[PDB]
């Protein structure tokens, strides 16, 4: 009908369930609620064996699975979105699609907030001036008002500088790489001149 | 049949039994080969054992080759036929000699199973059908 | 001046999902182009062939045994390019333009795409000036002009490479008696041949002196099937340099019947439906 | 290191939870009637390699420990192999004891390069 | 000698003939022998018959590359090398090419 | 061959009675090497091959 | 979806527990009220996932060897040919009409054995060794595997003695 | 780690999106 | 619940002509796969099938 | 929203040439599968394609 | 089921009984072969279905034998 536009487009049959779940939850403005219920369901399948038996065992009938998922999800602040979603995934035997629908829901939510998770690998631990002059250098690697979520790391094999890891792209602004590409260029010149 | 065993997996039997009957007969004849006596084994229509193994492989969704035979259809006949050996003096001196039987289709020995077993074995006894009605019986070309 | 102009660019990453049969599935590379040359972390290049919704299908220009699942694929930013120019004369290069003669890198050269749309109707003109091959059976009976495509078809060991070789050597002989504007710079593309025959052929071309005008592109029998597939296109780009700048070029794609076998291998390993004689459509 | 996933005839899929072996690498199977050696053919994705076996895969259980060797099939080379019978994995078949090895070399190798060819027939 | 998919009887006959003619010596005079047999018989899986020619190449590549010799490599029935690689290609699910061989023939 | 043998092995003379069986076999394009007639050659005592 | 963002869900990430503690008291009676509509879960047994044309796909059977005789609950023998990640495809030594979806499969621990020995001389067996001539079971007989390896290069001598066929054409 | 059983989704149908959209669009109030 | 055996006959209710199915294999999701002794033109999905 | 018709032509924005696609199928998830009138070397998987 | 396709079509050409009106239906199916190869799939299917065959040859067609009935 009239659903909100998804923040970023995705692949098929496990991410389309997440895009539909996101558009329904943004139509109800329960975006942080059903993400929390999805995390609670990940932990639920982590905790008990009888619950993941309804997702892995092929000999449980559909009637048992849909009636257990209906009867155990009657109340307790679970939204109509999550309860109808688990009815819809239990009706089809597709309860195994939860672990792959939550990561696409997470990517959808991490795109509606205009954020970006990153990893800064520095040779030494950072100060409160060695960090503040880094993020203004790191914010030119996003193309909009994306606020990076700083993640610091340590690696002594860098000789100072920083490496950014955006999980999509990697900027090697280190010195140990700079003295590597210095020697390659100076050796590729002396073999010419 | 004081000296003959018969392993009979007929056409009514399931295809794994028809596939497995040469290996059963060879494991029976390896008693005589491996204990110093002498064996002689005839696999009548090894071209039906290959058909039974093709049926089992195509129903197990194995990738087919030419004539829909699996990849290990040469290995099937070779790991059976190489058990027909003449053992040395330290292993008792026993022997097992095999006579596989392959039915060709109008003499076309360029078919797949016929080329496989021709490459495996130590010679052929050809039995052409033009020599058969000419009076020459056995019709040995 | 290298120090003041040094920015490490934002390298777009990609994991290898699954490799094998000379084609890798590459997660990521969200901005890669179709047909773009990508670079694996082992140094072996690759062409982004099938951009799919979730992965990228990369044919691997070389041996796929050096690639593992979880290796990083870096995109180079441009379509599959070979170095073309006057620095390629004299050089024995592989299917991607990297020199295998061991005489150092190709200097005085310029990168250009291997897959260029051929010139149209209005770009041609009639084939008017002759190209002498030095084989008087050919030059008397089957005369060949400049701008022609002439199939040397025959059996195994019937003298096809010899007609090609005599044409290349005769170009060296005529190039010392003609002005600059009409000089034929030859390319030999050896696809699917033995490396020993390409070595003896390079010896022949340098001991007669014809290697001064010859480029030799060799994707031999041990080279990967995408390299044998791509080597005619690399050679045709290197000769299109001389075609496009007013000069004249000769090219021998020796055994395109082995390029078609390399392409049949590539297509049948991509699960593409075979056609007549199991070749793709 | 890795454990057997599928055994479909001579083709064995092995699952490695950590680091995958390379293609053409050798894999020994721990606990078997004979020395079963697998050779990696491709990486199927999902941390699973697909191997082709050098012996019979009869008697193979899903979950059998498969160890990475880190190299292709390495066979004994040298003058000590003269007059000896080796199989594909370099084992003595003539039952005359071990094979005196100057070195062990991987059977997979690139062709000699263009500078290494000789140009004289 | 790389016997690729040899019959085991003919492999044993070649081995005994090499002992008799003197090109293979047994016992303490083994070092004066002139050949190395590499045997993958017919009774082996296609993965084993596809790499016996590579094992024969490795033993000969040692004598070429280290000892600096002129080596002979008898790949017995190269067609059986072809058909063993055809079998390992069909077992790996690759689509066969023309007449039935592997697409990477 | 398994379906044809499962049908065909029931048409037998046993120690109770007898079934004399006459079964016409269509041979496609007169090709006796076709597998559907070539499978049912071993299932018969007397084959009466009619030729074109 | 990718693996780098899915392997970080092994860590807990909820920061609220209003459903984990709610259904944990509610899961077990909701499971138990359809306990007779359950089937007992198999690990080292096997349950027939599907069957047809003499092939049974078998869920479970965690420790079958490749080529091992498995037995169904109808007594029909099978042979585990291709072990897969999620099932075992076994081949049925007989009619699969007595094998239904949901039948129990029991491994026997034996690769396919046959009766060999002096007592099998003069007998008519089927392809598995069991007698079909109807004159009792095979006595004076020990079992042996059918997939033994052939003798090697060194375990043979040259073929020298003649075996007489009695036919003049082949013997000449 | 028992969450590794739920790693790959086992879809018994292709048009599952239509079934879950028949059940999630009526979850909107 | 309670799949029919293989080779068993099934009778489709609601069909105009008497349509008899014969079970050929168990597909695995409580589904049998059948071949029809008469024409299947007119079969509706969900139409009741009574095992014999 | 508002998928193009089959046989309708589409224009890829930002190419080296005028890459005109032509819709051949409706794949099913608001995806139309097109045949390109020119070479697709240089296409990126986000490229805006207008519908004529 | 391409045999069943032509089989259920060509079996409706029937000579009905006197109880059902005595009407008739005569089918004349036309199969084109490729270079005389009647050993094709559809050609052998319809040859096995139909009663007669009016086989027309190209070599008799250009000998002036027209209609070229072999
Ligand atoms: N004009 C000629 N006069 C005499 N001998 C020739 C001539 N041309 C070729 N030959 C001989 O014929 C042999 C084959 O020639 P060439 O190498 O051209 O064959 P080819 O076409 O390359 O075959 P292949 O591609 O199979 O190697 C060569 O060894 C050469 O010695
Ligand atoms: Mg040539």
Which phi and psi angles does D5 have, rounded to 5°?
-100, -55
Contact C199 D117 (CB under 8 A): yes
Among C220, C262, C224, CA closest to C67: C224
Chain D segment 7-46 residues within 8 A of B by beta carbon are 8-10
Residue G60: beta bridge partners? G46
**Whole-angstrom Cα distance, residue E8 to residue B87?**
12
State how beta strands E37-41 and E2-6 pair. Answer: parallel
**Whole-angstrom Cα distance, residue A72 to residue A67?**
8
HEC sequence for chain B: CCCCCEECCCCCCCHHHHHHHHHHHHHHHHHHHHCCCEEEEEECCHHHHHHHHHHHHHHCCCCCCHHHCCCCHHHHHHHHHCCCCEECCCCCCCEEEEEECCCCECCECCCHHHHHHHHHCCCCCCECCCCCCCCCCCCEC
Q: Which segments within chain A are labelled E, that is strand?
A: 115-117, 119-122, 147-149, 152-154, 161-165, 169-174
**CATH T-level fold of C81-281:** Rossmann fold (3.40.50)
Q: Which segments within E1-105 are labelled E, that is strand?
A: 2-6, 37-41, 75-76
Q: Provide the 8-state DSSP code for A5.
A: P
**How many helices (H) and strands (E) in chain I?**
0, 4
Contacts of C279 (CB under 8 A, 6+ apart): C260, C263, C264, C267
**Whole-angstrom Cα distance, residue E43 to residue D103?**
29
**Whole-angstrom Cα distance, residue D42 to residue F27?**
46
Q: Provide the 8-state DSSP code for E81.
A: H
Q: Retrieve residue I43's tokens.
A: 């079969």
CB neighbour class for A28 (10 Å; exposed up to 12, middle 13-18, buried from 19): middle
**Residue H12 DSSP SS3:** coil
Q: Provide the 8-state DSSP code for A1.
A: -
Element (H, E) at A22: helix A15-27
End-to-end Cα separation, chain J, in angstroms: 15
Residue in G with minimal Cα distance to C69: G3
Q: Retrieve residue G168's tokens.
A: 């003049």
End-to-end Cα separation, chain K, in angstroms: 30
Least CB-CB distance to H19: which of A46, A52, A92? A92
**Whole-angstrom Cα distance, residue K65 to residue K56?**
10
**Whole-angstrom Cα distance, residue D27 to residue D7?**
14
DSSP line for G142-155: EEEES-PPPP-STT
**Whole-angstrom Cα distance, residue B21 to residue B49?**
8
Q: Residues A34, A21: contact at Cβ < 8 Å?
A: yes
Least CB-CB distance to G18: which of A42, A57, A77? A77
Residue C29's Cβ-side half-sphere holds a number of Cα atoms within 13 Å equal to: 37
**Cβ count near G105 (within 10 Å):** 26
**Whole-angstrom Cα distance, residue F31 to residue F37?**
8
Q: Please give the angle made by the CA atoms of A148, A154 and A158, to the nearest 5 degrees.
A: 105
HEC sequence for chain D: CEEEEEEECCEEEEEECCCCCCCCCEEEECCCCCCCEEEEEEEEECCEEEEEECCCCCCCECCCEEEECCCCCEEEECHHHCCCEECCCCCECCCCCCCCCCEEEECCCCCCCCCCCCCCC
Whether the CB of G50 is below 8 Å from some CB of chain I: the reply is yes
Q: Residues E74, E2: contact at Cβ < 8 Å?
A: yes
Distance C192 CA to ligand 2 centre (A): 10
Q: Provide the 8-state DSSP code for I28.
A: S
Q: Please give the angle made by the CA atoms of G103, G105 and G108, to the nearest 5 degrees.
A: 160
**Whole-angstrom Cα distance, residue A42 to residue A19?**
18
Q: Residues A180, A187: contact at Cβ < 8 Å?
A: no
Q: Residues C161, C204: contact at Cβ < 8 Å?
A: no
**Cβ count near C273 (within 10 Å):** 10
Q: How many residues does chain C have?
A: 281
Chain C segment 93-122 residues within 8 A of J by beta carbon are 115, 117
**Whole-angstrom Cα distance, residue G163 to residue D54?**
35
Contact E55 D75 (CB under 8 A): yes
Report CA-CA distances (Å) from C185 to C125, D68, I15: 20, 52, 80
Q: Retrieve residue D21's tokens.
A: 């072996």
Are chains F and H touching, using the cut-off of 8 Å on CB pairs and a minimum of 3 such pairs? no
Which chains have 3 or more CB–CB distances shorter than 8 Å to chain E? B, C, D, G
State how beta strands G77-83 and G68-72 pair. Answer: antiparallel
Among C281, C265, C252, C133, CA closest to C193: C252
Residue in B with minimal Cα distance to F37: B105
The gap from C-alpha C166 to its chain's centroid, in whole angstroms, comes to: 22
Query: Where on the phi/psi map is residue G171: left (φ > 0), alpha (ψ -120 to 50), or beta?
Result: alpha
**Cβ count near C72 (within 10 Å):** 16
Contact F29 K48 (CB under 8 A): no
Q: Provide the 8-state DSSP code for G15.
A: S
Q: Provide the 8-state DSSP code for I9.
A: E
Distance C220 CA to ligand 2 centre (A): 12
Element (H, E) at G125: strand G124-125
C to E CB pairs, distance under 8 Å: 28
Q: Please give the angle made by the CA atoms of B31, B36 and B42, to the nearest 5 degrees.
A: 50
**Residue A147 DSSP SS3:** strand
Answer positive or negative: Cα dihedral of B126, B128, B132, B136.
negative
Segments making up each domain of chain C, as ranges: 11-80, 81-281
Nearest-neighbour CA in chain C from D62: distance (Å):
22
**Whole-angstrom Cα distance, residue C23 to residue C50?**
10
Contact J41 C117 (CB under 8 A): no
Report CA-CA distances (Å) from C246 to C181, C184, C239, E86, J9: 8, 11, 12, 49, 38
Q: Which segments within chain I are labelled E, that is strand?
A: 9-12, 19-26, 32-36, 49-51
Q: Retrieve residue B61's tokens.
A: 């969704």
Cis bond upstream, residue K67 (ω within 30): yes
**Whole-angstrom Cα distance, residue C154 to residue C135?**
16
Element (H, E) at A137: helix A132-138
Q: Residues A101, H16: contact at Cβ < 8 Å?
A: no
Q: Retrieve residue I48's tokens.
A: 């009741």
Closest ligand by atom to C167 CA: 1
Element (H, E) at E89: helix E78-91
Contact C30 J39 (CB under 8 A): no
**Whole-angstrom Cα distance, residue D9 to residue D58?**
8
**Residue G133 DSSP SS3:** coil
Whether the CB of D83 is below 8 Å from some CB of chain E: the reply is yes
Atom number of ligand 1 nearest to Cα C197: 27
End-to-end Cα separation, chain H, in angstroms: 39
Nearest-neighbour CA in chain C from J36: distance (Å):
13
Q: Retrieve residue E56's tokens.
A: 């024969």
Residue in K with minimal Cα distance to F25: K48
Q: Residues E14, E22: contact at Cβ < 8 Å?
A: no
Among C2, C57, C51, C48, CA closest to C24: C57
Atom number of ligand 1 nearest to Cα C166: 1
Q: Which of C138, C159, C163 to mutate to test the pocket of ligand 1 (most atoms within 8 A of CB)?
A: C159
Distance C255 CA to ligand 2 centre (A): 7
CB neighbour class for A145 (10 Å; exposed up to 12, middle 13-18, buried from 19): exposed
Chain C positions touching A177 (Cβ under 8 A) are 8
Closest ligand by atom to C254 CA: 2
Atom number of ligand 1 nearest to Cα C254: 25
Q: Which of C161, C162, C165, C220 to mutate to test the pocket of ligand 1 (most atoms within 8 A of CB)?
A: C162
Q: Whose CA is nearest to atom 8 of ligand 1?
A: C159
**Residue G32 DSSP SS3:** helix
Q: Residues C201, C195: contact at Cβ < 8 Å?
A: no
Distance C165 CA to ligand 1 centre (A): 10
**Whole-angstrom Cα distance, residue C14 to residue C37?**
14
Residue A169: beta bridge partners? C12
Torsion angle of C-alpha atoms D100, D106, D107, D112, degrees rounded to 10 = -110
Measured over all CA atoms, what is the biggest interatomic distance in chain G, rounded to whole angstroms? Answer: 93
Contacts of A5 (CB under 8 A, 6+ apart): none
Query: Where on the phi/psi map is residue G30: left (φ > 0), alpha (ψ -120 to 50), or beta?
Result: alpha
Q: Residues E41, E80: contact at Cβ < 8 Å?
A: no
**Residue I24 DSSP SS3:** strand
Chain B positions touching F6 (Cβ under 8 A) are 12
Report CA-CA distances (Å) from A130 to C272, D100, I5: 55, 61, 75
* Ligand 1 contacts CB of residue C162 (under 6 A): yes
**Whole-angstrom Cα distance, residue G83 to residue G96?**
19
> Helices A49-56 and A31-47 meet at what angle, rounded to 10?
100
Nearest-neighbour CA in chain G from C75: distance (Å):
19
Chain A segment 53-92 residues within 8 A of H by beta carbon are 55-56, 79-81, 83-85, 87-89, 91-92
End-to-end Cα separation, chain E, in angstroms: 23
Q: Retrieve residue G35's tokens.
A: 């306990």
CB neighbour class for F31 (10 Å; exposed up to 12, middle 13-18, buried from 19): middle
Report CA-CA distances (Å) from C46 to A35, C60, C250, E33, G28: 40, 4, 28, 48, 54
Residue in F with minimal Cα distance to B108: F33
Q: Residues D88, E55: contact at Cβ < 8 Å?
A: yes
The answer to the question of whether K66 is labelled as a binding residue is: yes
Q: Retrieve residue C117's tokens.
A: 């749309």
Full domain range(s) for residue D67: 1-72
Nearest-neighbour CA in chain B from G98: distance (Å):
14
CB neighbour class for K43 (10 Å; exposed up to 12, middle 13-18, buried from 19): middle
- Radius of gyration of the CA atoms of chain B, in A: 16
Element (H, E) at G110: strand G104-111
State how beta strands D2-8 and G77-83 pair. Answer: antiparallel
Query: Where on the phi/psi map is residue G60: left (φ > 0), alpha (ψ -120 to 50), or beta?
Result: left
Q: Which of C161, C189, C198 to mutate to test the pocket of ligand 1 (most atoms within 8 A of CB)?
A: C161
**Whole-angstrom Cα distance, residue J39 to residue C115?**
10
HEC sequence for chain C: CCCCCCCCCCEECCEEEECCCCEEEEECCCCCECCEEEEECCCCEEEEEEECCCEEEEEECCCHHHCCCCCEEEEEEEECEEEECHHHCCCEECCCCCECCCCCCCCCCEEEECCCCCCCCCCCCCCCCECCCCCHHHHHHCCCECCCCCCCCCCCCCCHHHHHHHHHHHHHHHCCCCCCCCCEEEEEEEECCCHHHHHHHHHHHHHCCHHHCCEEEEECCCCCHHHHHHHHHHHHHHHHHHHHCCCEEEEEEECHHHHHHHHHHHHHCCCCCCCHHHCCC
Whether the CB of G113 is below 8 Å from some CB of chain D: the reply is no
Answer positive or negative: Cα dihedral of G109, G111, G115, G117.
negative
Atom number of ligand 1 nearest to Cα C156: 26
Residue in B with minimal Cα distance to F10: B12
Q: What is the CATH number of the domain that holds J18?
A: 2.40.10.170
**Residue E30 DSSP SS3:** helix
Q: Residues G111, G64: contact at Cβ < 8 Å?
A: no
Q: Please give the angle made by the CA atoms of C123, C125 and C128, to the nearest 5 degrees.
A: 150
DSSP line for chain F: -HHHHHHHTTS---SS-----------GGG-TTSHHHHHTTTT-SS------
**Whole-angstrom Cα distance, residue B129 to residue K13?**
43
Q: Retrieve residue G121's tokens.
A: 């001389």
Q: How many domains does chain I have?
A: 1
State how beta strands I19-26 and I32-36 pair. Answer: antiparallel
**Whole-angstrom Cα distance, residue C67 to residue C16?**
8
The residue whose two tokens read 């006459």 is: F22
**Cβ count near H9 (within 10 Å):** 19
The residue whose two tokens read 């031999």 is: C220
Q: Retrieve residue C30's tokens.
A: 């969200």
CB neighbour class for C218 (10 Å; exposed up to 12, middle 13-18, buried from 19): buried
Q: Provide the 8-state DSSP code for K24.
A: B
Among C212, C204, C201, C135, CA closest to C176: C212
* Ligand 1 contacts CB of residue C156 (under 6 A): yes
Contacts of G32 (CB under 8 A, 6+ apart): none
Residue D13: beta bridge partners? D6, D50
Measured over all CA atoms, what is the biggest interatomic distance in chain J, rounded to whole angstroms? Answer: 30
**Whole-angstrom Cα distance, residue C132 to residue C138?**
9
Contact J41 C33 (CB under 8 A): yes
């Amino acid at each position: 009908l009239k659903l909100p536009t998804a923040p970023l487009q995705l692949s098929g049959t496990s991410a389309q369930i997440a895009t539909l779940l996101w558009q329904v939850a943004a139509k109800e403005n329960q975006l942080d609620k059903v993400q929390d219920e999805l995390y609670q369901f990940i932990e639920l399948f982590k905790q008990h064996s009888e619950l993941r038996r309804l997702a892995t065992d092929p000999f449980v009938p559909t009637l048992v699975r849909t009636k257990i998922i209906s009867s155990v999800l009657k109340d307790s602040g679970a939204s109509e979105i999550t309860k109808k979603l688990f009815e819809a995934l239990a009706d089809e035997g597709a309860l195994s699609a939860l672990l792959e629908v939550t990561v696409n829901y997470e990517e959808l939510m991490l795109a509606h907030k205009k954020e970006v998770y990153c990893t800064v690998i520095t040779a030494e631990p950072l100060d409160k001036l060695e960090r503040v002059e880094l993020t203004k250098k790191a914010e030119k690697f996003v193309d909009a008002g994306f606020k990076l979520v700083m993640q610091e790391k340590i690696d002594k094999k860098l000789l100072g500088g920083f490496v950014i890891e955006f999980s999509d792209r990697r900027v090697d602004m280190s010195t140990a790489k700079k003295v590597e590409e210095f020697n390659n260029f100076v050796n590729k010149l002396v073999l010419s001149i | 049949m004081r000296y003959t065993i018969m392993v009979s997996a007929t056409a009514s039997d399931a295809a794994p039994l028809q596939f497995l009957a040469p290996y059963s007969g060879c494991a029976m004849a390896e008693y005589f080969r491996d204990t110093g006596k002498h064996g002689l084994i005839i696999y009548d229509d090894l071209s039906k054992q290959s058909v039974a193994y093709r049926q089992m492989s195509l129903l197990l969704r194995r990738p087919p080759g030419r004539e829909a035979f699996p990849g290990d259809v040469f290995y099937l006949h070779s790991r059976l036929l190489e058990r027909a050996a003449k053992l040395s003096k330290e292993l008792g001196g026993g022997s097992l000699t095999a006579f596989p039987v392959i039915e060709t289709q109008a003499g076309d020995v360029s078919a797949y199973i016929a080329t496989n077993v021709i490459s495996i074995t130590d010679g052929q006894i050809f039995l052409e059908t033009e020599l058969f009605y000419k009076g020459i019986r056995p019709a040995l070309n | 001046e290298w120090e003041k102009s040094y920015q490490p660019p934002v390298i777009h990453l990609g994991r290898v999902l699954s490799v094998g049969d000379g084609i890798a599935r590459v997660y990521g590379l969200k901005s890669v182009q179709a047909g773009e040359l990508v670079c694996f972390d082992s140094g072996v290049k690759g062409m982004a062939l099938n951009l799919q919704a979730d992965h990228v299908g990369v044919v691997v220009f070389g041996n796929d045994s050096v690639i593992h699942q979880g290796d990083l694929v870096y995109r180079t930013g441009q379509i599959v390019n070979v170095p073309i120019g006057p620095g390629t004369l004299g050089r024995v290069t592989d299917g991607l333009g990297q020199p295998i003669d061991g005489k150092g890198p190709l200097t005085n050269v310029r990168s250009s795409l291997v897959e260029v749309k051929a010139p149209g109707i209005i770009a041609r003109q009639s084939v008017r000036e002759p190209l002498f091959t030095g084989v008087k059976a050919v030059d008397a009976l089957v005369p060949i002009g400049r701008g022609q495509r002439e199939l040397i078809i025959g059996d195994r060991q019937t003298g096809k490479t010899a007609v090609a070789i005599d044409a290349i050597i005769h170009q060296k002989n005529c190039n010392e008696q003609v002005p600059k504007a009409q000089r034929v710079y030859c390319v030999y593309v050896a696809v699917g041949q033995k490396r020993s025959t390409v070595a003896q052929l390079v010896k022949l071309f340098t001991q007669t002196g014809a290697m001064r005008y010859t480029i030799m592109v060799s994707a031999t029998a041990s080279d990967a099937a995408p390299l044998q597939f791509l080597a005619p296109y690399s050679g045709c780009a290197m000769a299109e340099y001389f075609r496009d700048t007013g000069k004249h070029g000769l090219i021998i794609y020796d055994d395109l019947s082995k390029q078609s076998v390399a392409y049949r291998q590539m297509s049948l390993l991509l699960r593409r439906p075979p056609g007549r004689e199991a070749f793709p459509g | 290191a890795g454990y057997v996933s599928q055994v479909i005839g001579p083709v064995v899929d092995v699952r490695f939870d950590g680091e995958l072996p390379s293609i053409l690498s050798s894999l020994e199977v721990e606990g078997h009637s004979v020395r079963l050696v697998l050779e990696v053919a491709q990486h199927m994705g999902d941390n699973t390699v697909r191997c082709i076996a050098m012996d019979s895969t009869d008697g193979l259980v899903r979950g059998q420990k498969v160890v990475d060797t880190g190299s292709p099939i390495k066979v004994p080379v040298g003058r000590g192999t003269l007059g000896r019978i080796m199989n594909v994995i370099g084992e003595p078949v003539d039952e005359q004891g071990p094979i005196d090895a100057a070195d062990i070399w991987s059977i997979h190798r690139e062709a000699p390069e263009f500078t290494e060819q000789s140009t004289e027939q | 000698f790389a016997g690729v998919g040899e019959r085991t009887r003919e492999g044993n006959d070649l081995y005994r003939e090499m002992i008799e003619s003197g090109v293979i010596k047994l016992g303490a005079e083994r070092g004066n022998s002139k050949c190395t047999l590499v045997y993958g018989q017919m009774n082996e899986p296609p993965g084993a018959r596809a790499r016996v020619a590579l094992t024969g190449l490795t033993v000969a590549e040692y004598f070429r590359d280290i000892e600096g010799q002129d080596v002979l490599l008898f790949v017995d029935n190269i067609f059986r090398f072809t058909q063993a690689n055809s079998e390992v290609s069909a077992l790996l699910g690759r689509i066969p090419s023309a007449v039935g061989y592997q697409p990477t023939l | 061959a398994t379906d044809l043998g499962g049908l065909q092995e029931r048409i037998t003379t046993t120690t109770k009675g007898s079934i004399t069986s006459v079964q016409a076999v269509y041979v496609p394009a007169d090709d006796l090497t076709d597998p559907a007639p070539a499978t049912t050659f071993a299932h018969l005592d007397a084959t009466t091959v009619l030729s074109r | 979806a990718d693996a780098k963002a899915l392997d970080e869900l092994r860590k807990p990430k909820f920061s609220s527990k209003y459903l984990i503690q709610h259904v944990s008291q509610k899961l077990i009676p909701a499971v138990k009220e359809w306990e007779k509509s359950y089937q007992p879960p198999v690990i080292h047994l096997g349950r027939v996932l599907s069957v047809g044309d003499g092939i049974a796909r078998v869920y479970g059977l965690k420790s079958v060897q490749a080529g091992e005789l498995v037995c169904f609950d109808s007594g029909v023998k099978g042979m585990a040919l291709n072990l897969q990640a999620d099932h075992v495809g076994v081949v049925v030594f007989g009619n699969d009409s007595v094998i239904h979806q949901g039948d129990l499969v029991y491994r026997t621990g034996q690769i396919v054995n046959v009766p060999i020995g002096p007592g099998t001389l003069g007998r008519v067996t089927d392809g598995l060794g069991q007698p079909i001539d109807g004159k009792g079971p095979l006595t004076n007989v020990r079992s042996s595997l059918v997939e033994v390896k052939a003798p090697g290069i060194i375990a043979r001598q040259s073929v020298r003695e003649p075996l007489f066929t009695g036919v003049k054409a082949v013997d000449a």
